[model samples]
Target: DVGRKLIIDQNVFIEGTLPMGVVRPLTEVEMDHYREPFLNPVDREPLWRFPNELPIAGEPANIVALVEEYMDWLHQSPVPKLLFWGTPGVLIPPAEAARLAKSLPNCKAVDIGPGLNLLQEDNPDLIGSEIARWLSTLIGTGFPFDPHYVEVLGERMHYVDVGPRDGTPVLFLHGNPTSSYVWRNIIPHVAPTHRCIAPDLIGMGKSDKPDLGYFFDDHVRFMDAFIEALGLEEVVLVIHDWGSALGFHWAKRNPERVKGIAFMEFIRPIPT
Candidate 1:
């Protein structure tokens, strides 16, 4: 079935071996630059030792844990109410999502067709747009949050803003390993009537990754500046993960500015 030579190069650098064979051809120019490194199996000898030595090396992965991880999150997040989802192209199977949905009477889950697991390098345009579309379906239950860029502190910030301009303001702050994008499913549902605001915190999301100390203090500094610049009133705060510390400090310093508070997933120090 040599259908025009796919011309793809495959290597498992971490595995120290090439389980992937080629289906197409590479010119001397291509082979010289790329294939030469792995062409000699002996040259790759030093590389495989590490993953091989890893506790879980040469074992199956993603072949099943996709199910366990989601189940664990559901229990651990103790997701009070949820709209969990998975793509067939990912870890958990759609039918399992259905199973989880059935088992947990309080939760809802959907199979959103094709999706990618390693998000950072997921199938370029497919994964994000599909998920965004799915999340959008959950909108209209509230205001529709949209991307708004502005200068808040010492940098440009990306925020999601919507709902009644004069309504009580709601600030959604995310923590580590997540960005404003994390609020995609929640914001639109809230923004319909509430003045909802969410932003990608410093060095996270699309926010400026300034070349300086990436401390929690550094993040709070800019967030403080953003709130001040917006002249926001009756601040209702929602905090998650790392954002808890920053919101805590801000609320402490300006108690009068904070009208209401809500928090989830507060990742405290393990006190090791």
Candidate 2:
């Protein structure tokens, strides 16, 4: 139930219409503001303009062929765009967003203007509001809360700490759609002995989702900054979904800082 709410808010934007005008083409100031709330889920930051460069190709019978072509262009294009404008306007054609999302190394499929409009038109306020209310209820009931505020790469990062502060640090990184809330049930068991830190990555949770510089690498950099900011020399790392890739990249750069790692469901680079 809680998960559904998160997904609905993410894909539908129930709080309100994001002022795209604020970040269309995205000014430096806008980007700065955008990145803040996305760093922490507990902040419940408002949704704003998603990155606008995702590619959209209307339905083609041969998805494989279309994907190949898209990949070629994606490789050469300086900016990536979302493909939500594809055929059957109501639903992004099957395998379209996922194929694109998986194919592009650093790219993600985000809902854009047209996509949001379609959702609003289809779902209507009544349905949207109900989903939002249900989601709020679920969150209100959940627990194991111990929120913390720290700086990552000089940016303020808010996280939920569920373990003993004095215990050994064990950072749990969450992927898109879930915040530190994802660890609520499990943190208590780990908290007695280890310090559990779960951070909402940029643009997903209460963390800031500034309008610019939200590429995959930028997120990785933020993680690096996050680690350094905390002055965490050696810690156990736990990663889930997209968090796995981001965490792995950070560990690759700072192997000495890692004591060990455990990965749950996650994405991995296609083997060469």
Number of backbone collisions per candidate:
3, 21
How do the residues 1-272 of candidate 2 rate in per-residue lDDT, one tens digit apiece? 55434623453332222322112233444333333334344333322211111213432223224334433544444332222222233223434555656665434343333322122222223322332232232211244465577766656677876655674487877654345654554455456667777787765655555544454555666777777777777776666545655665566555566655543333332212
TM-score per prediction, in order, is: 0.48, 0.49
Off by over 4 Å in 1: 1-145
Q: Tell how far residue 268 is off in model 1, in angstroms.
A: 3.1
Stretches of candidate 2 exceeding 4 Å from the true structure: 1-141, 270-272
Model 1 clashes, total count: 3
* Residue 99, candidate 2: alpha-carbon lDDT: 69
